[PDB]
Ligand binder design. Structure first.
Ligand SMILES: *CCC(=O)N1CCC[C@@H]1C#Cc1cnccc1-c1[nH]c2c(c1Nc1cccc(F)c1OC)C(=O)NCC2
Length: 305
């Protein structure tokens, strides 16, 4: 059952813009609940320009909130002022796309492989709740801590009915360079087209946030994929890691890995990370962890088809 907590605007203080983009505008703030004096750091989202879309996103998030999962973003509630806003716990390290681009020189193999495991765990949770995300990408993964990531942005996500295996889209804007070939050609989305997007997300992490098919127009992508061309092997990836990405991009959807299998394979690689990713100076790299004494110091695309 989907239940939204409507948080009174008078409960929020110190709201400041964090940034804007295709996702709309995100602000940070402090939520002081009624009765309790706790000051909870929150992120607040508004869409660009509209109420229909953000409420649909709230519904999807509330629908999959029970039992929930550590690698899936959960909605604290919504706020009704001049716009409808979504409220969630603030992820102080931001989105994983910007994080990999900014901390490239300190991201070791263990971190990249554990992020792959965690994103697959969050997606496996969503598949069990019959949810097709349709927008998995490094820009829609958030960093709670350098060691703990969460999937966010349910703006395009759809719940499949009990007797439904696929979602047939209309003409809304969609991320072509992260989509399976069948989604580009026939507007068909399934858990296996989310696996294709997962493969593209992994490629983004392994290249430290490179743009996929950079300088290639979205209208040429279907023909590139029908010719058998795929994103290149990242220079840190051994063949075993690249072969997982290539399996995610197979034409036959049922031949692609399942999220349950990706959890197992990436967990195996995370048990011996320097065998699977070759990074110069890997053993010397460090990122802040909540187990560190000084961790508190650290806390101070879409087109019409
Ligand atoms: C990639 C860059 C990026 O996401 N940001 C640059 C600065 C501003 C923005 C941020 C953020 C952030 C921080 N803390 C938590 C959540 C988010 C966030 N970023 C995005 C999404 C979210 N998620 C979010 C935000 C507020 C309220 C929510 F309910 C919620 O979850 C749905 C997002 O949904 N789309 C991508 C950017």
């Amino acid at each position: 059952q989907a239940l939204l907590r409507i948080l009174k605007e008078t409960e929020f203080k110190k709201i400041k813009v964090l940034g804007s983009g295709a996702f709309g505008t995100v602000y940070k703030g402090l939520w002081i609940p009624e009765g309790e004096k706790v000051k909870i750091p929150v992120a607040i989202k508004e869409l660009r320009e509209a109420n229909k879309e953000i409420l649909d996103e709230a519904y999807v998030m509330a629908s999959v909130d029970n039992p929930g999962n550590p690698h899936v973003c959960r909605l604290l509630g919504i706020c009704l002022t001049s716009t409808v806003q979504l409220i969630t716990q603030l992820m102080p390290f931001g989105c994983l796309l910007d994080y990999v681009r900014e901390h490239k020189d300190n991201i070791g193999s263990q971190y990249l492989l554990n992020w792959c495991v965690q994103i697959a765990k969050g997606m496996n949770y969503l598949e069990d709740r019959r949810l097709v995300h349709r927008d998995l990408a490094a820009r829609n993964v958030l960093v709670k801590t350098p060691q703990h990531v969460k999937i966010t942005d349910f703006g395009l996500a759809k719940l499949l009915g009990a007797e439904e295996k696929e979602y047939h889209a209309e003409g809304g804007k969609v991320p072509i360079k992260w989509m399976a070939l069948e989604s580009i050609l026939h507007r068909i989305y399934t858990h296996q087209s989310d696996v294709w997007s997962y493969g593209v997300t992994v490629w983004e992490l392994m290249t430290f946030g490179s743009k996929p098919y950079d300088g290639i127009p979205a209208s040429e992508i279907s023909s590139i994929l029908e010719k058998g061309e795929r994103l290149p092997q990242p220079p840190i990836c051994t063949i075993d890691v690249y072969m997982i990405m290539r399996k995610c991009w197979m034409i036959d959807a049922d031949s692609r890995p399942k999220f349950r299998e990706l959890i197992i394979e990436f967990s195996k690689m995370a048990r011996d990370p320097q065998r699977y990713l070759v990074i110069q100076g890997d053993e010397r790299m460090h990122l802040p962890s909540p187990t560190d004494s000084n961790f508190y110091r650290a806390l101070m695309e879409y087109l019409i088809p």
